[PDB]
Amino acid sequence: DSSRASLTRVHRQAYARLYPVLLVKQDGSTI
Amino acid sequence: YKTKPTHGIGKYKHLIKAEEPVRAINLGTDYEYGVLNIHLTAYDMTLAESYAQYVHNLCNSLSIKVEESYAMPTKTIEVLQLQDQGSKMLLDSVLTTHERVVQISGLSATFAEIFLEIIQSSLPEGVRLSVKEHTEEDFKGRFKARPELEELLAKLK
Amino acid sequence: DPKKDQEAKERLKRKIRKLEKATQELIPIEDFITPLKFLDKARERPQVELTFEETERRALLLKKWSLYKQQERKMERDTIRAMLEAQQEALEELQLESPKLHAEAIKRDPNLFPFEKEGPHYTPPIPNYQPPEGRYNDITKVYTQVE
Amino acid sequence: NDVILEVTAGRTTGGDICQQFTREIFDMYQNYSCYKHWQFELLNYTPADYGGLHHAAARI
Amino acid sequence: GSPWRLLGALCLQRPPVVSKPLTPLQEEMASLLQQIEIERSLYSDHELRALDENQRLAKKKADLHDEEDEQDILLAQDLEDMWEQKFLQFKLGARITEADEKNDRTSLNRKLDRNLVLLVREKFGDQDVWILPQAEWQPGETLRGTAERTLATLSENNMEAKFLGNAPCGHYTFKFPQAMRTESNLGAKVFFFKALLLTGDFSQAGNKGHHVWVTKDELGDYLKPKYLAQVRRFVSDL
Amino acid sequence: RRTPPLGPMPNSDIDLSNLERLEKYRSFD
RNA sequence: AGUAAGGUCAGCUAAAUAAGCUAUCGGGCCCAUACCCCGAAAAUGUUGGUUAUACCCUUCCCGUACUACCA
Ligand SMILES: [Mg+2]
């Protein structure tokens, strides 16, 4: 399953805020 | 004591692996594979690290020895896009590539099919899986380049 | 020539031997290293205490999460067991029918590796998609070993 | 058997004509070694004071 | 020889194209992890830009002490508007395609979040039975090689498959009916080999009557009860 | 001079051939 | 046979930021060469160990040095 190890978080003491974005690839696929 | 039947009751080093001090690559037999590197490439740092942890824990439950878990250097690539009605390239975004490698060994040939099926079914979105046999070049790629050694070598050439 | 050309090459080898036998430094990982910009206290956001209801909701969710992941492991563990039992039983049947084919079946696959598989995308590729025009520039820092 | 060739500028007239010509002859044998794929190892080389050769020794 | 007939079957499987949708329980966990991540994260450059811009507006309205006129053309909140407008214009690919709507169990463009297994229909004794692709073993050829040859024998296909290992993933042994059962040919021993469909698809000559692609849940509609049980062992639905 | 033990010696059941594959204690408890 | 001691730019010495001189290369000066002027390049005998190294210790090698006596 793709959700087996997808629900994660940044495991760092100090880190800047990260935003969920969609990366459109050259073929139109997104991640 | 030597003559007593209880001789050698206190022996303990025969139960311990001999640790008497880079690493030789052990090629597998006709029925087992050699040292394998499991590359995990993704644009998200969290996804790469999390799945490497999952693979590391999966091998332990499967009684597969893990040689070493380490991270490859992060690759940063600028993303530029052409402006509308213009011929000038302008920076759009910055993308960083994070690679996590888990090194395993002693994988059975028959069990390789099952092991590869499980890991590929659990591959997260945006994460690229690449399993390669361990080679000296891959290990040497983790070290800083030495221009001084190259300059001297160029003179010899 | 004998005192200049010959002596030059001998000293070049000595320098090579010292460098080859010297320890090699690993390339640092930027992910593990904390940038100094984060050390600045200006980026420290204020902390808001969670309410009693909010903490209670998270605690119950984590308790439900433990059971959910345990069931996922059971399904995965049984999946591996189901494959292993079927494969081993198939090999035993093959050996009885033809021992020669059994020997080839248990051999390793030289063409198996390298094995590359890409993760599923969030959306399928568009059949008619035109990506914008642009260029990829690599700005990865190069680390060199000196002394 | 290998040859240790030596060229010397004979003292027969004034100027550096003898000495300048020795350089041309020495280069001729060095180039002839390359033409015959012979290894030319330089042993002695004493240049003159006007771009010539006083005496030179080499091993072929 | 042997009374049993050696058969090499190919278990061609299409890996999922899109990620499986999150369960309702996972959606709650995903939001919490995102919420926790924001709480423990430091101020980003975008966040710092917005805070300073708000202060500049206060430093320009409360007192006329600002000594700079140009400042910044675009504010942080205004910059978010441009990103939001572009996202709305862009259209994402359809996770559920026309094949799912029409229940076209022949195309590979159906159930991109699931696993598809190739099934073909073969006629034995004037009876149509849905089985996995298979071929008879031949001298001077490995058991896995027969499965590879089976892919080449399909009806006008350019598909490329990646076999995993040499040992079979399962077996299925059956005996012929007593009407034709003889000592020379007592039955057959089918051996299954799994492979991953990298690229390629069948042509448009024959589609409905030739091959079908179904998941494990709906795999029982085509396979016989005895044949289905063996297939469901080495085929996972994770 | 040696004398055989009167019974099973400690750690005799430990298989030294597969010592690498044997599970270790890994903890004090 | 013993014991002492030395191994460093091409060469020779000084220092262990491994420098100066000559030699060497490039330019200028001169009808030309040399001198001269400007600029550049050039090395720790080797082995391993000395926090880590170098001047140290030590492995090995070349050369050097003194002693080898009394019946
Ligand atoms: Mg000059």
User: Taking the CB of residue D49, how many other CB atoms lie within 10 A of it?
Assistant: 8
Range A1-31 has CATH code 3.90.400.10: no
- Could you tell me the two tokens for C144? 């060199």
Look up residue E17 and give its DSSP letter. Answer: S
Length reported for chain B: 157
DSSP C141: P
Give the distance, in angstroms, between residue C1 CA and nucleotide G10 C1'. Answer: 10
Chain G footprint bases within 7 A of protein beta carbons: 10-11, 32-34, 43-44, 46-48
Provide the CATH topology of domain E104-237: Nucleoside Triphosphate Pyrophosphohydrolase (3.90.79)
User: How far apart are the C-alpha atoms of E158 and E198, rounded to whole Å?
Assistant: 11
Q: How far is CA D16 from the centre of its chain?
A: 15
CB contact under 8 A, C123 and A28: yes
**Distance separating alpha carbons of residues E209 and D58, to the nearest angstrom:** 89
Q: C119: which 2 tokens?
A: 């993760």
CA C36 – CA B134 distance, rounded (Å): 35
E143/C91 CB distance under 8 A: no
Q: Are B77 and C58 in contact (CB under 8 A)?
A: no
Domain boundaries, chain A: 1-31
From chain C, pick out residues whose CB is under 8 angstroms from the CB of E173.
93
In angstroms, rounded to a whole number, what is the distance separating the alpha carbons of residues E168 and F4?
51
CA distances from E15 to C119, E20, E140 (A): 10, 12, 32
Q: Which helix (H) or strand (E) holds B73?
A: strand B66-82
Amino acid occupying residue B67: E
For residue D53, report the distance from its CA to the centre of ligand 1, in Å: 18
d(CA B69, CA B43): 19
Q: Nearest by CB to C122, which of E18, E192, E233? A: E18
In sequence order, which residues have a C-beta less than 8 Å from that of residue B143 and are 6 or more positions away?
A: C24, C25, C26, C27, C145
Cβ-defined contact of C124 to E112 (cutoff 8 Å): yes
- Would you give the DSSP letter of residue E96? S
Q: How far apart are CA C97 and CA E6, in angstroms?
A: 9
Residue with tokens 């100094």: C36
**CB under 8 A, 24+ apart: contacts of C15-23:** C15/B152, C16/B149, C16/B152, C16/B153, C16/B156, C19/B146, C19/B148, C19/B149, C19/B152, C20/B149
Separation of alpha carbons C90 and C98, rounded Å: 12
Do the Cβ atoms of E20 and A1 come within 8 Å?
Answer: yes
Footprint of strand G on the protein (CB under 7 A): C 3-4, 7, 11, 14, 17, 21; D 49-50
Residue E22 contacts A, CB cutoff 8 Å: yes
User: DSSP label at A30?
Assistant: B
Whether the bond into C114 is cis, omega within 30 of 0: yes
- H or E element, residue E199: strand E187-199
Q: Residue D41 C-alpha to ligand 1 middle, in angstroms?
A: 27
What are the strands, taking DSSP E only, across E50-127? Answer: 116-123
> Cβ contact (<8 Å) for E30 and A7?
yes
Q: E193-224 burial by CB neighbour count: b if 16+ within 10 A, else e?
A: bbbbbeeeebeeeeeeebbbbbbbeebeebbe
> Within an 8 Å CB–CB cutoff, is residue A2 touching chain B?
yes
Tally of CA atoms within 13 A in the half-sphere of D52 that contains its CB: 17
Say which experimental method was used. cryo-EM
Find the E79 Cα to ligand 1 centroid distance in Å. Answer: 69
> CB-based contact (8 Å) between C43 and chain A?
yes
**CB < 8 Å to F9, chain B:** 8-9
Name the residue type at position B41.
T
Site from B27, B107, B143, B150 to mutate, C interface, most C CB atoms within 10 angstroms: B143
- How far does residue E145's CA lie from ligand 1's centre (Å)? 79
By the 8 A CB rule, do C131 and A26 touch? yes
Determine the distance between C18 (CA) and G48 (C1') in angstroms. 13
Ordered DSSP codes for E120-169:
EEEESSS-EEEE--EEE--SS--HHHHHHHHHHTSSSB--EEEE--SS-S
Alpha-carbon distance of E21 to E112, in angstroms, equals 11
Domain boundaries, given as residue ranges, for chain B:
1-135
Q: Residue E109's CB: how many other CB atoms inside 10 A?
A: 17
Instruction: Calculate how far, in angstroms, residue D15's C-alpha sits from the geometric centre of ligand 1.
Output: 22
Residue B15: closest C-alpha in chain F: F16
B120 CA: distance to closest CA in chain C (Å): 7
**Axis crossing angle, helix C52-97 with helix E225-234, rounded to the nearest 10:** 110
Question: Any CB–CB contact under 8 A between B111 and chain C?
Answer: yes
Please name the member of F2, F5, F11 whose beta carbon is closest to the beta carbon of B15.
F11
Contacts of F8 (CB under 8 A, 6+ apart): none
Asked if B113 and E238 come within 8 Å (Cβ–Cβ), the reply is no
Contacts of A17 in chain E (CB under 8 A): 37-38, 41-44, 47
Query: How distant is the Cα of B34 from the closest Cα of chain F, in angstroms?
Result: 16
Chains D and A contact (Cβ–Cβ under 8 Å for 3 or more pairs): no
Q: DSSP of C87-124, one letter per residue?
A: HHHHHHHHHHH-HHHHHHHTS--TTT-SEEEEPPBSBP
| Ligand 1 centroid – CA D55 distance (Å) | 22
Indicate the SS3 state at residue D50.
coil
Check CB contact of E164 with chain B, cutoff 8 Å.
Answer: yes
Among left, alpha and beta (phi > 0; psi -120 to 50; other), residue C131 is: beta
Alpha carbons E194 and E161: distance in angstroms, whole number: 9
Closest chain F residue by Cα to residue B6: F5
- CA–centroid distance, D47 to ligand 1, in Å, is 14
State the Cα–Cα distance between residues B50 and B48, nearest whole angstrom.
6
* Contact criterion met (CB below 8 Å) for E19 and A3: yes
User: Which uninterrupted H or E stretch holds E198?
Assistant: strand E187-199
Query: B99 - beta bridge partners?
Result: B41, B72
Residue C121 touches partner B, C-beta closer than 8 Å:
yes
Q: Per DSSP, what are the bridge partners of residue F2?
A: none
User: Which nucleotide does the CA of D51 lie closest to, via C1'?
Assistant: G33
E strand or H helix at E8, and its extent?
Answer: strand E4-14
Please give, rounded to a whole number of angstroms, the shortest distance from the CA of E38 to a CA of chain A: 6
Instruction: Find out whether B114 and C78 touch, Cβ atoms under 8 Å.
Output: no
Count of Cβ atoms closer than 10 Å to residue C137 Cβ: 13
Task: In whole angstroms, give the CA distance from residue B49 to residue A15.
Answer: 15
Is any Cβ of chain B less than 8 angstroms from the Cβ of A16? Answer: no
Chains that touch F (3 or more CB pairs under 8 A): B
Cβ contact C76:E40 at 8 Å: no
Q: Which of B63, B61, B38 is nearest to B51 (CA)?
A: B38
Q: What share of chain C is helix, strand, coil (3-state, %, to 5)?
A: 50, 10, 40
